Amino acid sequence: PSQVRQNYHQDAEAAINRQINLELYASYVYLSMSCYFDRDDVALKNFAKYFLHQSHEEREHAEKLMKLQNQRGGRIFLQDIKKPDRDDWESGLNAMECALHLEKSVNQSLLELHKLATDKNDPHLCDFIETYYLSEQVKSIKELGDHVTNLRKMGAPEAGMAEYLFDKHTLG
Amino acid sequence: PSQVRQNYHQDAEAAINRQINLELYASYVYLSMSCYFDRDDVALKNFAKYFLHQSHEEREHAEKLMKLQNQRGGRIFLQDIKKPDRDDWESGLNAMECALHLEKSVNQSLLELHKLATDKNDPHLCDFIETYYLSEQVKSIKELGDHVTNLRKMGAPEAGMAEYLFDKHTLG
Amino acid sequence: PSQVRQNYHQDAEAAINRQINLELYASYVYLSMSCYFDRDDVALKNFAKYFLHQSHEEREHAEKLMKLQNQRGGRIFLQDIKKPDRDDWESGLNAMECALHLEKSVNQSLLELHKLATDKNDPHLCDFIETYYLSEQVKSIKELGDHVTNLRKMGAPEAGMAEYLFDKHTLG
Amino acid sequence: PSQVRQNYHQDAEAAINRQINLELYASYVYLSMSCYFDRDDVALKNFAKYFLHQSHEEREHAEKLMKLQNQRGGRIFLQDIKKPDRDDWESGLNAMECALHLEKSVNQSLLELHKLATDKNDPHLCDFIETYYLSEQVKSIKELGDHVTNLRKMGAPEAGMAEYLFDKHTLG
Amino acid sequence: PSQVRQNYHQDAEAAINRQINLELYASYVYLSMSCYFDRDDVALKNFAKYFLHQSHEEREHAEKLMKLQNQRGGRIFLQDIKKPDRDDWESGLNAMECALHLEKSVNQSLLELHKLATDKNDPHLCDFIETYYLSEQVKSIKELGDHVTNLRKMGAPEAGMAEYLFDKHTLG
Amino acid sequence: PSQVRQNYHQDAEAAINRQINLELYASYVYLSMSCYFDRDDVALKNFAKYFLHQSHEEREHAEKLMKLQNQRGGRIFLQDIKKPDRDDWESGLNAMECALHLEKSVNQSLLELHKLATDKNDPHLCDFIETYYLSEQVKSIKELGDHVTNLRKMGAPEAGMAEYLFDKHTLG
Ligand SMILES: [Fe+3]
Ligand SMILES: [Fe+3]
Ligand SMILES: [Zn+2]
Ligand SMILES: [Zn+2]
Ligand SMILES: [Zn+2]
Ligand SMILES: [Zn+2]
Ligand SMILES: [Zn+2]
Ligand SMILES: [Zn+2]
């Protein structure tokens, strides 16, 4: 056992490693979205900027989970980062909806991780999750829902000016 | 065909996708090294800082390659980022030697990519590789070789103060 | 022979003169586009500003080729700058598509010139082209492709607000 | 008819297009002279700087005429820019004398253009010419005559230090 | 083999060592020229300043080639720096012409070195040469050709005021 | 005889030429040492920095001796700069000991030169040597002796951390 390990369950360590992988996967998916929006035939530069920022934030979340794992005496075990479900995100609205789905799944993972930490009476893990991940996930989900709502209202994807003006105004 | 595609061969596109994957893998391996050095039983904070910086630089290299793919009209196809070869890097000297090996493999990949771009008479791809990746890889390999040499001379791994003082002086 | 002439083939000199003429022609075409967009019945001031900037950049590129010709001991031979293929560019989308075509032709000429310089084993000419012209041409082609894509999606030319809003947001 | 056009005769529009071409040609001739003086076997850097400045001024004059054409509702019709009368300008004195001849021909063109605008009772065109082109051409012709006089007195072209010292002193 | 050595041929290493010696020799020749022009019986202070600057630049070029040799894992082997072909450079024009010849020989050496690096498919060596040495050599050769041309026209060496005024104006 | 020559014996001129050559040789040897310490398998960056500084100081000494030669009306005669005694300096301690030996030999040459200048009753040459070279040589020899003493005490070369820590602390 690590000399710093205290009130850290093996299940908590495994769940934290799984969350690390899921946050790295979310970063990779956001990177894919950014790449798609940097294409010449998509050409939505603020969409690409937004999703690159999301990718970097998800990488920061994974690194924070790594720091937590190390601070608690748990051992980080990295896995293959699976490729995103697709490379063609097909629209700004569709990419925003997929980002909403991704952040909802990340939130669900964080929620079951918090449930696990509460089962093991690991108050530091619970506080870490609810302080650094749950509030940020709620904010991200709300922002993505706002983006999806505004894009749907403007008429995206059918309204070709909707995605462009959302790119200029909301994402610029 | 992309409207911007011109003098960009399918083989070059595939090679750049493979290079993007390899740069992402190198970033992941550097992240693993940083995680290992952030452990309480390793506790080399400047080693972890160094390898986190390397991970971020490799991620930036992958992002630049994807920007290149989009600029040339090629389509980025992301793959699974494979798990690093191991999670326990066993020493500062061993981690630096593995980083040397990784950067030499990345350099070899970039070199065969440049060879391919020269075969296809793609001067822009060749210049991009040369100005952004080959010089950087040579600098990284030379720096890692210096690190390995200094750690070996100091007595690492067996000299327990060698890695600590390398951490404080070279990496501080 | 010029006292500075060294490893500079006559064919390289002729190709550089032809590139000078082509870049002067591109400057002239961009000037025509700017003039068209300054018309009262077109009245797209950021389109005119964009194409005037492009004409000035192409003139700078021609002057850089002139400086290269003189630096290598080659003699600059200027030719008639042919008038642009049209004076009425009939839309912002059409002008951007024609600018894309023009920059792709300029890139093709630069690629042929680089191929020639590689055949004559003129490394300085190759480095000059790939350092000052190939990357800039790739960037210009990618930017023009983005412009064309955004204008097409917005609904240009038929969507009369598409060109106006692109003028205001992308080009402003 | 253009919605802004009024008191703008077709002959005035044609004369303005001809002046556009003539000023573009003057810019091209100044470019040729600058190129000649940037040669290694001429090596007169302030002569080249002076004639590049003249080329840019003539380009600005052509663009101002373009702006005038558009402001008046006339349509700019661009023509082939004929190559300069020669590529070897044979001396600093000879290039200065040819620049004098060129600016005097440009002024003569502007004078017959002003005569035409006066015959057609186009006071705005007359004012435009006289405030932006006639005084500028008189100043340019006087400066070129001063340059020619000083170079002739110094002993150019035969006095090889005359052009060098004029380059350093008058043009530096 | 060096731990950093990768895609670095023995012939490339030998050619780099020869170029190091050639750049040190060029620095030594420029030092000789500076010494000659600092003499009381020639006493051209800006000529001496110019050639001392050239000597220091050639020394910096040799040091950069040394850094390249070490970065690539090649071993620097220094040779005797041969004395300059003569100690009396006989005039400002003669020294400028000899400097032109020296820089053209250095350029030819760099060109055959680039040919060698291209034969061995060493893209990093080719890029290093073309970005740090070929453009600088072309600029130096053009500048020296300009100097020789201006000195020849001014009347050097026979015109004793020519070298003095070139010293004051071009070199001051 | 130079118009400036006065109380400057031919033997003093020859001795100063020999001293210029010896200072250039010392600069070359220091450059070799710096190159050795910039190698990946040596990787002592402050040792390389120190010896590069020493080579630049020795080059300044040679340049100042040549300025002295020219001020006195003597003619500088440059010779081949002999290759350094070896390319592999095999340790920081060994390189510092060889630098001590080199500076002691340079000091002995300067002392012989001062003895010669005293024999010829050349007070300006004696003052020049003792003002710019003897004090500097004594300081350099004392500093090199301190470096050698500290390296021997620390346990260099066998103590592999001795050279590293001397690099970081004394030379950093
Ligand atoms: Fe709007
Ligand atoms: Fe003067
Ligand atoms: Zn997250
Ligand atoms: Zn990389
Ligand atoms: Zn261009
Ligand atoms: Zn004009
Ligand atoms: Zn050089
Ligand atoms: Zn010295």
CATH class of the domain comprising A10-170: mainly alpha
d(CA E101, CA F160): 49
Is B103 marked as a binding-site residue?
yes
The set of chains that have 3 or more CB pairs under 8 A with F is B, E
Longest distance between any two alpha carbons in chain C, whole Å: 60
Indicate the SS3 state at residue A42.
Answer: coil
Indicate the SS3 state at residue E91.
Answer: coil
Is D147 marked as a binding-site residue?
no
CA proximity to A29, closest of A52, A10, A49, A4: A52
Helices (H), ranges, chain D: 10-37, 45-71, 92-119, 123-129, 135-154, 160-169
Which residues are bridge partners to C81 per DSSP? D81
Question: For residue F84, what is the DSSP state?
Answer: P
Give the CB-side neighbour count of residue F88, counting CA atoms within 13 A. Answer: 4
d(CA E3, CA D134): 73
CA proximity to B43, closest of A56, D154, A71, A89: A71
Cα–chain-centroid distance for residue E121?
26
Ligand nearest to the CA of F59: 8
d(CA A27, CA A64): 13
d(CA F136, CA F159): 31
Q: In chain B, what residues touch C126 (CB-CB under 8 Å)?
A: 123
- Phi, psi values for residue D81, rounded to 5°: -85, 105
Asked if the C-beta of F53 comes within 8 angstroms of chain E's C-beta atoms, the answer is no
- Phi, psi values for residue A80, rounded to 5°: -60, 135
User: Tokens standing for F119?
Assistant: 């024999």
User: Tokens standing for E108?
Assistant: 């030819």
Amino acid letter, residue F37? F
User: Which of E104, E139, E148 minimises the CB distance to C6?
Assistant: E104
d(CA B112, CA A104): 42
Give the contacts of A111 (CB within 8 A, at least 6 positions apart). Answer: A134
Indicate which of B134, B148, B151 best probes the interface with E, i.e. most E CBs within 10 Å of its own CB.
Answer: B134
The 3 state secondary structure assigned to D4-18 is CCCCCCHHHHHHHHH
C38/D82 CB distance under 8 A: no
**After which residues does chain B show a gap where C to N exceeds 2.5 Å?**
none
Give the contacts of A12 (CB within 8 A, at least 6 positions apart). Answer: A72, A74, A116, A117, A120, A122, A125
Which residues are bridge partners to E139 per DSSP? none
Give the contacts of D47 (CB within 8 A, at least 6 positions apart). Answer: D33, D34, D37, D92, D95, D163, D167, D171
Method: cryo-EM
DSSP string, B87-142: S---SHHHHHHHHHHHHHHHHHHHHHHHHHHHHTT-HHHHHHHIIIIIHHHHHHHH
Bond into E157 cis (ω within 30): yes
d(CA F15, CA F71): 15
Query: Is the sign of the CA dihedral D56, D58, D59, D65 positive or negative?
Result: positive
Provide the resolution (angstroms).
2.5
Rounded alpha-carbon distances, angstroms, from residue E135 to C70, C72, E17, E68, F65 = 13, 10, 20, 17, 34
To which residue do tokens 């010849």 refer?
E101
Return the number of other C-beta atoms located less than 10 Å from residue A108's C-beta: 12
Q: In chain E, what residues touch C135 (CB-CB under 8 Å)?
A: none
d(CA C140, CA C103): 7
Query: Is the sign of the CA dihedral C148, C152, C157, C163 positive or negative?
Result: negative
Give the contacts of B55 (CB within 8 A, at least 6 positions apart). Answer: B27, B28, B29, B30, B31, B33, B34
- H/E run at residue F55: helix F45-71
Is D97 marked as a binding-site residue?
no
d(CA F84, CA F107): 18
F43/B150 CB distance under 8 A: yes
Cα–chain-centroid distance for residue E161?
28
The 3 state secondary structure assigned to chain C is CCCCCCCCCHHHHHHHHHHHHHHHHHHHHHHHHHHHHCCCCCCCHHHHHHHHHHHHHHHHHHHHHHHHHHHCCCCCCCCCECCCCCCCCCCHHHHHHHHHHHHHHHHHHHHHHHHHHHHCCCHHHHHHHHHHHHHHHHHHHHHHHHHHHHHHHHCCCCCHHHHHHHHHHCCC
To which residue do tokens 């051409």 refer?
D137
**Burial grade of B87 (CB within 10 A; 0-12, 13-18, 19 or more):** middle
User: Among all residues of chain D, which has the CA nearest to that of E170?
Assistant: D168
d(CA E60, CA E58): 5
B134/E121 CB distance under 8 A: no
Give the contacts of E169 (CB within 8 A, at least 6 positions apart). Answer: D164, D165, D168
d(CA D48, CA C160): 47
Which residues are bridge partners to E81 per DSSP? F81
In chain F, where the domains are located: 10-170
| Beta carbons of F79 and E83 less than 8 angstroms apart | yes
d(CA C81, CA D43): 26
Q: In chain C, what residues touch E142 (CB-CB under 8 Å)?
A: 4, 70-71
Q: In chain A, what residues touch B52 (CB-CB under 8 Å)?
A: 63
User: Tokens standing for A87?
Assistant: 């490379």
| Beta carbons of C29 and C94 less than 8 angstroms apart | no
